């Protein structure tokens, strides 16, 4: 269209933010380049008023989605670029779970040949020793739960619901200089956390057996079918009080990368079956689909001639943890001309944060990759 043509090459960016968070006033300035053919953003930000009172990652989301790579089959869904050069207004509300919130208004428009982001930001109700005002968040924007990357828990939950089981767990090997060890790392339906303390040498226990075998083990009754040595060698059974179980190898590039245990307790009988293949297909499919939790979910707002977006940002915490930031976002065009209104889709964002080695002021170097996805028709 008309707004498309402008982003064909590298575009300079100016960003300015005026902020008040719990009475703490501050200002931030940023500049860089955006390349929407790559979905790439390079920028540097400076706190020009002194020290930044909030952790830098919490402002990344606030500090130009018109630079997102839309593949050809999705160009019909750039509201952002369609609103150019007149620009658009981005209001947004960010609720930090169990802490304060940001209210932000931003103008994103072309000034000359420079794409510009001007922001007013008001933050309220923050705890003085909270993660934000206490700068307890780690310096990155990895939109992930480090402790359960891949989200076995949630996938495992689904497996437990779908295969009508009382217990689900995944065992994974961990290398070592001349040997390895298998541990039970992720579990659904667990009664203890003592399964977490199990350590198996290779080929030992139910997990080691399944991983060396690469074939399942079905146990319809533990007490009748498992020897005393069997139970001695398989501590997960007694630890989680199992009366029946099925152990399944997990297959990747034609290798067993782990073990999945499905468990019945209180004498409850084993239910039907799944062919290891289906089981592996699921947990593949479910994990892959659920890894989209951090993406930006865009939906049209026909009445406001614009769009709205939702997402959640996971901020790692110093000691281990996650601070949640729930984002509600409104985008309305500046001009009164025609804009493109899209079918629901999402944006995937990779964000990297660093520091300029010759910069004494409080700052943030930001590299970002953003692609649109979620529509496969026409």
XYZ file of N, CA, C and O in Angstrom, residues 74-145:
288
model
N 0.679 -12.651 4.809
C 0.085 -11.939 5.935
C 0.077 -10.421 5.789
O -0.311 -9.734 6.743
N 0.483 -9.866 4.641
C 0.514 -8.406 4.554
C -0.867 -7.791 4.753
O -0.967 -6.633 5.178
N -1.935 -8.552 4.524
C -3.257 -7.978 4.709
C -3.534 -7.630 6.164
O -4.602 -7.079 6.454
N -2.594 -7.908 7.071
C -2.814 -7.759 8.503
C -1.866 -6.782 9.200
O -1.812 -6.777 10.437
N -1.125 -5.953 8.458
C -0.388 -4.836 9.063
C -1.305 -3.655 9.299
O -1.436 -2.769 8.453
N -1.982 -3.644 10.445
C -2.576 -2.383 10.857
C -1.481 -1.347 11.090
O -1.636 -0.178 10.721
N -0.371 -1.761 11.720
C 0.665 -0.811 12.125
C 1.193 -0.025 10.932
O 1.137 1.210 10.907
N 1.692 -0.734 9.913
C 2.263 -0.052 8.755
C 1.189 0.641 7.925
O 1.479 1.637 7.253
N -0.043 0.124 7.942
C -1.121 0.765 7.196
C -1.459 2.136 7.771
O -1.923 3.016 7.039
N -1.243 2.331 9.073
C -1.503 3.604 9.734
C -0.414 4.645 9.504
O -0.537 5.764 10.016
N 0.646 4.311 8.763
C 1.771 5.180 8.427
C 1.520 5.907 7.106
O 0.915 5.337 6.192
N 1.983 7.166 6.960
C 2.861 7.886 7.887
C 2.145 8.679 8.982
O 2.834 9.176 9.876
N 0.812 8.810 8.917
C 0.112 9.597 9.930
C 0.377 9.069 11.333
O 0.413 9.849 12.291
N 0.582 7.767 11.473
C 0.920 7.198 12.759
C -0.282 6.602 13.462
O -1.365 6.427 12.896
N -0.069 6.280 14.734
C -1.126 5.725 15.567
C -0.831 6.020 17.030
O 0.292 6.370 17.399
N -1.866 5.884 17.857
C -1.779 6.120 19.294
C -1.814 4.768 19.988
O -2.735 3.973 19.764
N -0.821 4.505 20.828
C -0.743 3.259 21.586
C -0.951 3.558 23.069
O -0.043 4.055 23.740
N -2.142 3.249 23.585
C -2.328 3.231 25.028
C -2.118 1.808 25.500
O -2.372 0.848 24.768
N -1.666 1.672 26.737
C -1.397 0.337 27.228
C -1.457 0.384 28.743
O -1.106 1.391 29.363
N -1.917 -0.713 29.322
C -1.923 -0.886 30.763
C -1.211 -2.179 31.106
O -1.516 -3.234 30.541
N -0.268 -2.090 32.030
C 0.586 -3.203 32.397
C 0.387 -3.432 33.883
O 0.816 -2.611 34.702
N -0.253 -4.543 34.234
C -0.470 -4.913 35.625
C 0.654 -5.867 36.003
O 0.790 -6.936 35.399
N 1.464 -5.482 36.982
C 2.516 -6.355 37.481
C 1.932 -7.181 38.617
O 1.474 -6.617 39.616
N 1.918 -8.506 38.452
C 1.253 -9.367 39.424
C 1.797 -9.098 40.818
O 3.009 -9.147 41.050
N 0.881 -8.790 41.735
C 1.187 -8.538 43.141
C 2.108 -7.331 43.344
O 2.859 -7.264 44.320
N 2.056 -6.374 42.421
C 2.772 -5.102 42.525
C 2.022 -4.086 41.670
O 0.909 -4.347 41.203
N 2.637 -2.924 41.457
C 1.961 -1.811 40.820
C 1.668 -1.993 39.347
O 1.725 -3.114 38.829
N 1.330 -0.900 38.662
C 0.975 -0.959 37.253
C 1.446 0.289 36.522
O 1.571 1.364 37.113
N 1.689 0.137 35.221
C 1.965 1.256 34.329
C 0.723 1.606 33.525
O -0.006 0.722 33.064
N 0.500 2.903 33.343
C -0.401 3.396 32.314
C 0.454 4.219 31.367
O 1.109 5.178 31.792
N 0.433 3.868 30.086
C 1.343 4.468 29.123
C 0.566 4.909 27.898
O -0.307 4.187 27.409
N 0.892 6.096 27.405
C 0.383 6.571 26.129
C 1.565 6.931 25.248
O 2.500 7.601 25.700
N 1.519 6.495 23.994
C 2.631 6.702 23.085
C 2.098 7.115 21.726
O 1.105 6.567 21.240
N 2.778 8.082 21.119
C 2.546 8.465 19.737
C 3.644 7.850 18.882
O 4.831 8.049 19.156
N 3.250 7.114 17.852
C 4.186 6.469 16.942
C 3.849 6.955 15.545
O 2.821 6.563 14.981
N 4.702 7.809 14.988
C 4.435 8.424 13.698
C 5.750 8.705 12.991
O 6.828 8.647 13.588
N 5.646 9.009 11.701
C 6.786 9.498 10.943
C 6.952 10.998 11.139
O 6.013 11.773 10.925
N 8.142 11.405 11.567
C 8.566 12.799 11.533
C 9.716 12.887 10.536
O 10.812 12.383 10.802
N 9.468 13.518 9.393
C 10.455 13.462 8.327
C 10.618 12.032 7.848
O 9.638 11.339 7.554
N 11.869 11.572 7.782
C 12.170 10.182 7.473
C 12.521 9.390 8.725
O 13.104 8.306 8.624
N 12.178 9.906 9.901
C 12.461 9.246 11.166
C 11.177 8.715 11.789
O 10.215 9.469 11.967
N 11.159 7.423 12.115
C 10.053 6.871 12.887
C 10.249 7.221 14.357
O 11.321 6.978 14.920
N 9.213 7.772 14.984
C 9.332 8.358 16.312
C 8.325 7.734 17.271
O 7.180 7.458 16.896
N 8.777 7.483 18.504
C 7.967 6.934 19.595
C 8.046 7.868 20.806
O 9.045 7.855 21.532
N 7.012 8.677 21.040
C 6.964 9.557 22.206
C 5.965 9.044 23.233
O 4.807 8.778 22.899
N 6.405 8.957 24.487
C 5.732 8.165 25.508
C 5.556 8.997 26.770
O 6.499 9.656 27.222
N 4.360 8.944 27.352
C 4.125 9.381 28.721
C 3.762 8.146 29.529
O 2.986 7.304 29.071
N 4.309 8.042 30.735
C 4.180 6.817 31.511
C 3.910 7.190 32.957
O 4.694 7.921 33.567
N 2.817 6.673 33.507
C 2.478 6.863 34.911
C 2.361 5.506 35.585
O 1.499 4.698 35.220
N 3.203 5.272 36.584
C 3.196 4.032 37.347
C 2.754 4.307 38.773
O 3.174 5.296 39.379
N 1.906 3.425 39.305
C 1.301 3.623 40.616
C 1.211 2.299 41.368
O 1.222 1.218 40.779
N 1.138 2.413 42.700
C 0.869 1.306 43.625
C 2.014 0.299 43.715
O 1.792 -0.862 44.064
N 3.247 0.720 43.447
C 4.389 -0.184 43.520
C 4.955 -0.247 44.937
O 5.018 0.767 45.637
N 5.377 -1.446 45.350
C 6.014 -1.634 46.651
C 7.468 -1.184 46.614
O 8.201 -1.481 45.665
N 7.876 -0.443 47.649
C 9.222 0.118 47.675
C 10.294 -0.967 47.646
O 11.361 -0.759 47.059
N 10.038 -2.128 48.253
C 10.947 -3.265 48.146
C 10.427 -4.339 47.194
O 10.782 -5.514 47.334
N 9.582 -3.965 46.235
C 9.069 -4.919 45.278
C 10.121 -5.236 44.234
O 11.246 -4.741 44.273
N 9.754 -6.103 43.289
C 10.710 -6.481 42.252
C 11.072 -5.293 41.367
O 12.225 -5.153 40.945
N 10.104 -4.425 41.087
C 10.349 -3.280 40.216
C 11.127 -2.187 40.946
O 12.246 -1.832 40.557
N 10.565 -1.646 42.028
C 11.263 -0.555 42.693
C 12.473 -1.048 43.476
O 13.333 -0.238 43.838
N 12.575 -2.354 43.716
C 13.732 -2.969 44.331
C 14.713 -3.580 43.354
O 15.649 -4.264 43.781
N 14.549 -3.290 42.066
C 15.367 -3.807 40.964
C 15.805 -5.260 41.159
O 16.986 -5.599 41.048
N 14.842 -6.134 41.441
C 15.137 -7.546 41.671
C 15.067 -8.406 40.409
O 15.287 -9.618 40.495
N 14.722 -7.832 39.261
C 14.621 -8.574 38.010
C 15.974 -8.673 37.312
O 16.762 -7.723 37.322
N 16.240 -9.837 36.714
C 17.483 -10.058 35.983
C 17.471 -9.248 34.685
O 16.412 -8.998 34.092
N 18.660 -8.840 34.228
C 18.809 -7.940 33.075
C 18.735 -8.716 31.765
O 19.747 -9.052 31.145
N 17.508 -8.997 31.343
C 17.229 -9.554 30.022
C 15.724 -9.449 29.791
O 14.978 -8.975 30.654
N 15.283 -9.893 28.618
C 13.860 -10.052 28.334
C 13.654 -11.394 27.641
O 13.051 -11.497 26.573
N 14.193 -12.442 28.260
C 13.848 -13.814 27.910
C 12.444 -14.068 28.435
O 12.224 -14.085 29.649
N 11.482 -14.229 27.533
C 10.077 -14.292 27.929
C 9.698 -15.736 28.280
O 8.853 -16.368 27.644
N 10.372 -16.258 29.316
C 10.368 -17.689 29.616
C 10.448 -17.953 31.122
O 10.911 -17.114 31.900
N 9.957 -19.127 31.533
C 10.160 -19.662 32.882
C 11.375 -20.589 32.863
O 11.252 -21.766 32.505
